[PDB]
Amino acid sequence: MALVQFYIPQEISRDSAYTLGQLGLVQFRDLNSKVRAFQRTFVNEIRRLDNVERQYRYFYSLLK
Amino acid sequence: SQKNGIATLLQAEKEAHEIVSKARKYRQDKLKQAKTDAAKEIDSYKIQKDKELKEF
Amino acid sequence: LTPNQVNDELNKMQAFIRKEAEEKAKEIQLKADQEYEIEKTNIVRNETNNID
Amino acid sequence: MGATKILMDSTHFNEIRSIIRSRSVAWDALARSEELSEIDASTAKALESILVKKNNGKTLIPLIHLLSTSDNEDCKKSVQNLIAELLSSDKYGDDTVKFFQEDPKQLEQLFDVSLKGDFQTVLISGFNVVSLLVQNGLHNVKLVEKLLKNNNLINILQNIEQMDTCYVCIRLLQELAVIPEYRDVIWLHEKKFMPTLFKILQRATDSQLATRIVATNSNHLGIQLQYHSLLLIWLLTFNPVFANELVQKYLSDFLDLLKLVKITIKEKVSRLCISIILQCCSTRVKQHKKVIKQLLLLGNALPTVQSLSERKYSDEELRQDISNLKEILENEYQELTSFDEYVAELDSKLLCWSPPHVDNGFWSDNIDEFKKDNYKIFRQLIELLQAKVRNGDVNAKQEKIIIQVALNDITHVVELLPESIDVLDKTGGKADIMELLNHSDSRVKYEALKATQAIIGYTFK
Amino acid sequence: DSWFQDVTREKAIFEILNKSNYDTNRKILIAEGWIPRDELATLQARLGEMIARLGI
């Protein structure tokens, strides 16, 4: 149903698959993420990161 | 088939890129085409104007 | 996880990739159409003013 | 040959194609009982075997004959599916496509059997007639234009409950629209289908994307329905006049495309939405000014684009469209003379917030323009505001839009100019501010409070 | 508080996914999978030993 996103290095790929497994994850496929061009290294996500830094600042200023 | 499947998925991505790239070459050409068939559209309209002129 | 679940995920995704591009290509060439007519209409209009 | 390759990539077409090819139909028995003559059943029997692998166009003739003559739903549907499958295939039913394409007669015949029998039977019939029309050797406006006016096919398309059927029909029309000539007949019938298409986009907006249930989400089925609807729009928008008209009638429905752009993360949906809005906002549409005005004032298109611009998605063309649209919207409204916009609004007594009325710079240049007998125009706005509260009452919706905007406008001039305080006193505006404070509506009270404070800062130093 | 939690969670997705080259030369596997939402609960219970199970 809902997309879940996991990262690790390839070394604990097996150790991960089993634990995920025991909790009820399904259709577990290891990827990279180049096969989903928007949700890969590009300018686009880096701009989103800036957008969150602005968010952080706005919350702090309002709480003050 | 996990370590057969990624390799297939990498190939699919490279393929998705080449089909979209053929269209973009096509588009440039489509623009060039518009100027050529409009070059032909003037000298066929020119002979049309000489038509109703010579008729006059 | 299981081989059947991974093969189900392989067909589905490389399909998603192939389909999205075919439509993607299709939008690019549809626009190629649009620019052909608009660009022709313009270019033609000027030269025909001179001709007239 | 192998025709066009349309309706062979879609799952929705494939699910309908399964229902027919699974159920079997023994033509020869039907013929013996008299519903067709024998030549036809044998011809359909043989044809089915050629589809799988075996040696024609000459099998075509009986199928044409059989269809028009027969009124038995089962045989024409099973046959139509087999003609349909053949046309697009390059494996089989290459020769099939030739006979149709050469001779205008088998197209016209093939049309007669459309709109008879079960809802499926007719869908296959429409596919096949459309299939040929979109190729370069048969073209007739008449079949499309009649089928559009005609009931049984158009009913299927209005139903949205059955995604698969609806999808196929919308695609049938949108493909004919890729060709220029069909656009003119299609635009006559726009009223009927076009509310159905906006509804599909609306449905799309209220449901979730965090599941992959049977309904529209961001699944395979969904990704095709959204794309086609939008695409259909986009096509007819290529003709500049249709696009001006389309925004002015359909305005309310139109504004919703901006929403779909946010909620979706899919460059197929997003791109198409951005392009259609772009094309109407283009210079080439006559009364391009008008459509920008409606969109900016009422619908608040401009702020929406500025957010959109930030979240770039990977697709070069998408980024290009978003940027072009940001420029056009923003530029067209602001570039009007400042005094002119203010007075035009003042005159109608139909003030609205706009990008330069919440901007300080606009007011600074305009202070001088008002002075004609101690800021006569400024006093005009003060009279106008006073009146609205007292006459036509306060706390009803119409009068409530004018007030909040007017109080915003006044505040800005007073902060900037210390000499306008006199004008408020003479007029009696000073009193009127105090009254808005008590009044219901949060937005009116905010603006009212800001007005009081602006006078106040200056009275005591 | 709710938007603050939401915004933290967006930063984390981008990072997981690789939004810069540095995340790449530090973890090279990013995997994909589908979790029913009625079960979303149990996956987050164990955050993952050196695995991030922060999801959507």
Side-chain angles (χ1 to χ4, degrees):
Chain A
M1 286 170 169
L3 184 76
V4 278
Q5 305 99 329
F6 307 121
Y7 75 160
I8 30 185
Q10 190 156 354
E11 167 65 59
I12 45 183
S13 61
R14 289 294 82 60
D15 296 92
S16 194
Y18 188 81
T19 310
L20 295 159
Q22 268 299 100
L23 294 171
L25 184 63
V26 293
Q27 296 182 291
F28 183 39
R29 158 159 284 277
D30 297 291
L31 302 176
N32 196 23
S33 281
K34 288 194 182 194
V35 290
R36 51 195 182 178
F38 72 115
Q39 288 190 149
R40 185 54 180 175
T41 50
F42 263 92
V43 294
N44 302 335
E45 295 184 282
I46 268 165
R47 293 176 210 277
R48 301 164 176 147
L49 188 60
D50 312 316
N51 302 5
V52 166
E53 297 305 302
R54 301 183 297 141
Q55 279 288 272
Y56 282 138
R57 206 185 293 122
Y58 296 160
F59 298 146
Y60 304 160
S61 305
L62 282 168
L63 291 168
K64 294 179 283 192
Chain B
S1 188
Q2 178 69 230
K3 325 296 166 192
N4 292 89
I6 305 187
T8 329
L9 293 158
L10 187 65
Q11 185 54 63
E13 177 256 269
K14 288 301 188 302
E15 288 170 81
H17 189 263
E18 196 73 77
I19 295 170
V20 189
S21 278
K22 300 167 180 183
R24 311 207 190 189
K25 193 135 285 310
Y26 191 75
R27 182 180 64 200
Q28 308 180 61
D29 294 336
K30 284 283 315 184
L31 311 189
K32 293 186 200 61
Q33 299 171 5
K35 308 185 182 68
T36 303
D37 293 325
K40 177 60 170 81
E41 187 63 69
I42 64 170
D43 59 39
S44 50
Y45 182 105
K46 187 73 189 62
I47 64 179
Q48 176 68 7
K49 293 300 211 172
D50 289 298
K51 201 182 189 305
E52 55 178 289
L53 184 58
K54 67 183 77 76
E55 278 172 289
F56 216 82
Chain C
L1 291 167
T2 68
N4 312 278
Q5 290 173 137
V6 318
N7 189 81
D8 293 5
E9 280 285 278
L10 184 49
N11 271 232
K12 172 188 282 287
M13 208 160 182
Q14 67 166 39
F16 269 160
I17 294 166
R18 282 179 292 161
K19 179 187 84 179
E20 272 183 296
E22 177 185 274
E23 293 175 28
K24 203 187 293 300
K26 193 171 192 66
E27 286 159 296
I28 294 158
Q29 74 179 231
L30 267 43
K31 210 173 76 178
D33 299 346
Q34 189 210 117
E35 280 166 288
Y36 175 91
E37 281 179 280
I38 293 310
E39 279 194 38
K40 187 199 173 62
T41 300
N42 297 130
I43 290 168
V44 171
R45 174 68 297 155
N46 308 343
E47 288 294 300
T48 59
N49 295 139
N50 303 349
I51 296 170
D52 284 59
Chain D
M1 305 204 52
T4 44
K5 309 301 175 180
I6 66 187
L7 288 301
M8 300 286 282
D9 55 71
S10 311
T11 308
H12 299 265
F13 189 80
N14 287 32
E15 287 150 77
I16 298 184
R17 204 176 60 188
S18 294
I19 331 295
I20 320 168
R21 67 171 159 196
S22 69
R23 194 212 74 206
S24 296
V25 186
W27 294 292
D28 284 61
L30 257 165
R32 285 161 202 142
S33 52
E34 188 79 284
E35 174 51 50
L36 37 136
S37 266
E38 289 289 307
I39 202 167
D40 299 295
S42 288
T43 292
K45 193 73 212 57
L47 185 83
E48 184 168 56
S49 306
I50 80 163
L51 180 57
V52 296
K53 190 195 186 184
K54 187 172 85 172
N55 189 65
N56 296 108
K58 299 182 183 57
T59 48
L60 189 52
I61 301 193
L63 308 159
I64 305 309
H65 289 166
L66 169 58
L67 285 166
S68 298
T69 298
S70 304
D71 292 291
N72 183 80
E73 293 69 49
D74 302 279
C75 71
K76 312 182 306 197
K77 196 186 310 178
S78 197
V79 165
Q80 282 292 46
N81 218 46
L82 297 178
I83 294 133
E85 282 195 54
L86 278 176
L87 273 168
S88 305
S89 294
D90 53 282
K91 301 194 303 176
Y92 315 105
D94 293 80
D95 284 343
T96 308
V97 178
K98 195 170 201 191
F99 268 55
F100 261 109
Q101 270 286 107
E102 289 285 83
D103 293 290
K105 298 179 277 307
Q106 311 191 78
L107 170 79
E108 202 68 56
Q109 294 192 110
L110 181 75
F111 196 50
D112 304 323
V113 61
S114 313
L115 310 144
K116 273 192 291 181
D118 209 70
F119 68 90
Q120 293 174 249
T121 309
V122 171
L123 194 49
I124 314 308
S125 304
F127 173 33
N128 295 345
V129 163
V130 175
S131 199
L132 288 312
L133 286 176
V134 296
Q135 284 178 259
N136 47 268
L138 279 166
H139 295 290
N140 201 12
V141 297
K142 193 191 76 180
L143 313 186
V144 176
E145 190 188 315
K146 174 142 195 279
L147 179 83
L148 274 164
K149 288 167 164 168
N150 296 131
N151 289 116
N152 187 334
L153 191 268
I154 195 149
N155 301 313
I156 300 170
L157 192 163
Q158 288 172 59
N159 307 128
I160 37 157
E161 297 189 90
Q162 298 176 148
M163 288 167 207
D164 310 318
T165 53
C166 198
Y167 175 74
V168 173
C169 282
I170 286 162
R171 185 142 188 204
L172 295 174
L173 300 176
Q174 159 280 317
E175 291 285 3
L176 288 154
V178 179
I179 289 178
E181 57 181 85
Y182 291 110
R183 297 164 193 182
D184 299 314
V185 286
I186 285 178
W187 176 247
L188 308 173
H189 316 287
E190 95 284 63
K191 308 291 199 301
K192 298 164 171 166
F193 52 93
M194 183 66 68
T196 292
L197 307 175
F198 284 110
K199 195 60 199 88
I200 300 176
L201 302 179
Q202 305 313 298
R203 192 187 64 220
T205 316
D206 54 79
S207 65
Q208 60 282 318
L209 319 154
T211 51
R212 294 279 167 247
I213 68 179
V214 62
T216 178
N217 293 107
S218 272
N219 61 122
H220 308 85
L221 298 181
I223 283 151
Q224 292 174 257
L225 295 151
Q226 286 172 289
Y227 161 94
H228 264 276
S229 318
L230 281 164
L231 191 50
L232 195 160
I233 301 177
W234 191 35
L235 278 172
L236 280 41
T237 308
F238 294 178
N239 297 104
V241 177
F242 293 1
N244 168 70
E245 286 178 290
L246 188 72
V247 181
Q248 295 172 332
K249 290 177 292 180
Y250 289 101
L251 182 67
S252 297
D253 308 86
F254 192 86
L255 289 169
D256 307 277
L257 276 54
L258 290 160
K259 316 301 162 304
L260 273 290
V261 182
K262 303 164 117 43
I263 188 164
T264 54
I265 67 210
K266 301 282 289 191
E267 301 78 53
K268 316 287 77 58
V269 184
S270 301
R271 182 170 161 189
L272 274 171
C273 291
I274 302 165
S275 78
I276 300 161
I277 299 172
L278 186 55
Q279 301 320 318
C280 292
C281 294
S282 303
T283 43
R284 49 193 199 72
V285 176
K286 49 176 217 62
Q287 308 172 70
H288 53 307
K289 307 280 285 293
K290 178 156 171 199
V291 304
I292 314 162
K293 297 164 171 316
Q294 286 176 309
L295 293 171
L296 181 269
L297 280 189
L298 287 194
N300 309 287
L302 177 63
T304 323
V305 186
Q306 294 194 2
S307 294
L308 287 167
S309 291
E310 291 187 306
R311 200 158 188 189
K312 291 198 181 198
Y313 307 92
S314 166
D315 182 344
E316 180 176 68
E317 274 73 43
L318 203 147
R319 293 164 184 168
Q320 299 323 96
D321 300 348
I322 200 90
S323 204
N324 197 336
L325 173 67
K326 183 193 201 190
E327 287 171 293
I328 297 177
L329 297 189
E330 202 190 92
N331 282 128
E332 187 263 337
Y333 206 91
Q334 291 197 321
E335 87 183 75
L336 287 165
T337 298
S338 308
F339 180 52
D340 283 80
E341 289 187 35
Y342 170 41
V343 166
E345 287 187 299
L346 190 74
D347 295 329
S348 309
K349 296 183 189 194
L350 191 69
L351 314 73
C352 311
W353 288 306
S354 296
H357 284 77
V358 296
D359 178 68
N360 284 295
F362 181 86
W363 303 106
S364 319
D365 292 299
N366 287 331
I367 271 173
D368 313 288
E369 302 285 316
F370 321 130
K371 193 196 268 302
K372 288 202 188 309
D373 186 5
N374 190 43
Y375 306 108
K376 186 70 190 75
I377 311 300
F378 185 59
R379 194 175 294 142
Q380 285 184 21
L381 179 55
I382 297 162
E383 281 171 303
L384 197 173
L385 173 72
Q386 183 179 232
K388 281 273 173 193
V389 169
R390 181 171 59 217
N391 306 109
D393 69 84
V394 62
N395 308 109
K397 291 182 294 179
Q398 184 167 249
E399 321 300 296
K400 275 193 301 177
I401 304 294
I402 312 314
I403 290 160
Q404 63 196 87
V405 179
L407 288 158
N408 181 61
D409 292 357
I410 69 187
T411 298
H412 301 282
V413 178
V414 171
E415 294 276 283
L416 290 180
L417 182 43
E419 302 175 60
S420 59
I421 305 295
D422 286 288
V423 194
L424 293 144
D425 306 321
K426 284 164 207 289
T427 310
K430 177 72 202 314
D432 185 63
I433 307 320
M434 296 303 251
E435 305 185 68
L436 288 302
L437 291 179
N438 301 95
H439 290 129
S440 308
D441 204 316
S442 271
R443 302 174 291 192
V444 169
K445 182 187 163 189
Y446 179 93
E447 284 304 349
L449 183 287
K450 292 212 304 160
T452 330
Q453 172 266 359
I455 307 168
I456 281 285
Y458 284 106
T459 305
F460 180 79
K461 302 311 303 195
Chain E
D1 304 308
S2 314
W3 294 320
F4 173 61
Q5 291 177 21
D6 294 321
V7 156
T8 298
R9 178 173 56 112
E10 299 180 328
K11 186 174 170 192
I13 284 170
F14 298 150
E15 210 177 66
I16 294 173
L17 286 165
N18 304 342
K19 55 170 178 48
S20 285
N21 292 128
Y22 307 126
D23 301 346
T24 305
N25 48 254
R26 183 180 65 188
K27 293 179 178 173
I28 59 175
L29 192 65
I30 311 91
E32 198 170 50
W34 296 82
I35 208 303
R37 282 186 296 153
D38 299 307
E39 292 171 55
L40 210 59
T42 49
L43 186 50
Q44 287 286 1
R46 183 179 291 264
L47 297 158
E49 317 183 287
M50 290 91 174
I51 308 94
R53 307 182 192 206
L54 287 167
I56 315 166

